[PDB]
Point group: none
């Protein structure tokens, strides 16, 4: 399943399209279970750098985003595993965008190439996320700006502090306590 | 000349943009309120029905009757008070082609009144209207519809509307 022509990559994308925004954007434990049953092995292969060849194809690169940015957020909830492949997802998102892959998938799926930037605790990534979401507009843009505001304010996502064993600052504590 | 006022409402909203339309910013809500409170009430008293004659002025009615309450009357029955009027005007604006006259970025404000109506017919209509828009706007229209097909209404409003949450609504509410 090493090449962009892999059945596995197409399977991941087919699974995502079938699930739809009903599942992409609204928490559901059955969907988490389902995603894990199908694609846990694929996640680990991607994380082991066995699927770098998927960067050759637009939809196979989308599959990489789904495995390395989305999968951990569905399937490793409440643990440091949720963030473990984020640097890899970002590295791949950058490469995919350089190849024009985000422009090659449908408008509905484009945001999955941009979410790794929203999920990074660094200002450059956040500004890049907002620029990339500008053409998508509406709620895509709103969400990118929501993330950028937290990072520009704290340099990180204070909601992660417990899981990552970081010391919460007074202003972060304030922010957390109030929403 | 209330023409200038309708234009001002649209320009306020257009320039604020999607980084403010969906946020919960008390400063923005206060700004919107202090500028357009009188306009909202004039529209609610049926003093601005003439704005149906134009596309942008009809958009202004949507912003005054559907969005304004949601920014400026939060957590109160006033959030819903002008919803029937907003749906009435949206129906008329769509009959006149005004939704199709404005770009997709702003067109959705003609359709949100249908997603905000506690009426399964309105919800099905909202899904049809958002269908060509797709993306997150269609998704949210479908989500609202899914809530209403089931219940006939929005359980999240039970507190405000002093409704006894049924057992099914109750367990719907505790879950997510
Ligand atoms: Ca090849
Ligand atoms: Ca904002
Ligand atoms: Ca669209
Ligand atoms: Cl956070
Ligand atoms: Cl959208
Ligand atoms: Cl509800």
């Amino acid at each position: 399943m090493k090449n962009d022509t892999a059945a596995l990559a197409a399977d991941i994308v087919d699974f995502w399209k079938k699930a739809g925004p009903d599942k992409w954007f609204d928490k559901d434990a059955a969907f988490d279970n389902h995603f894990h049953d199908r694609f846990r092995d694929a996640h680990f292969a991607a994380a082991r750098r066995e699927l770098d060849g998927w960067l050759e194809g637009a939809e196979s690169s989308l599959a990489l985003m789904l495995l390395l940015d989305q999968f951990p957020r569905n399937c490793f909830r409440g643990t440091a595993h949720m963030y473990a492949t984020d640097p890899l997802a970002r590295f791949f998102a950058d490469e995919a965008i350089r190849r024009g892959h985000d422009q090659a998938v449908s408008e509905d799926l484009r945001v999955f190439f941009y979410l790794p930037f929203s999920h990074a605790e660094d200002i450059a990534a956040q500004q890049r996320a907002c620029d990339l979401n500008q053409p998508l507009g509406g709620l895509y843009l709103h969400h990118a700006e929501e993330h950028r505001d937290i990072v520009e304010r704290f340099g990180r996502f204070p909601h992660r502090n417990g899981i990552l064993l970081r010391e919460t600052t007074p202003e972060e504590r304030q922010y957390l306590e109030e929403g």
